[PDB]
Structure 1
């Protein structure tokens, strides 16, 4: 490509699109933690027999 003097190529990170992905990944992480807690209770009810 061409070179433009006196100019800089800024980053390509869009904040909006990122924050939304942050929310979605937070929800996924919490769901996985919930699954961990479920398996923990499974092992608990088996142990306390």
Structure 2
């Protein structure tokens, strides 16, 4: 492509796109960590039966 002097390029990263991926990732992290708690509670209650 042809050159044009007196210009630079932007970073092609739009904040309106990229400031929702962190919200999605935080919700995914919390939904994954809920499983560790629901596993640990049943593992501790299936060993103090006797």
TM-score range, shorter chain: 0.7 to 0.9
Structure with greater Cα Rg: 2
With structure 2 as the length reference, what TM-score do the two structures score?
0.76
Taking structure 1 as the reference length, the TM-score comes to 0.77
Where does structure 2 lack aligned partners over 5 or more consecutive residues? none
Query: For the aligned residues, what is the CA RMSD?
Result: 1.3
How many residue pairs get aligned? The number is 49
User: How far did residue 7 of structure 1 move?
Assistant: 1.4
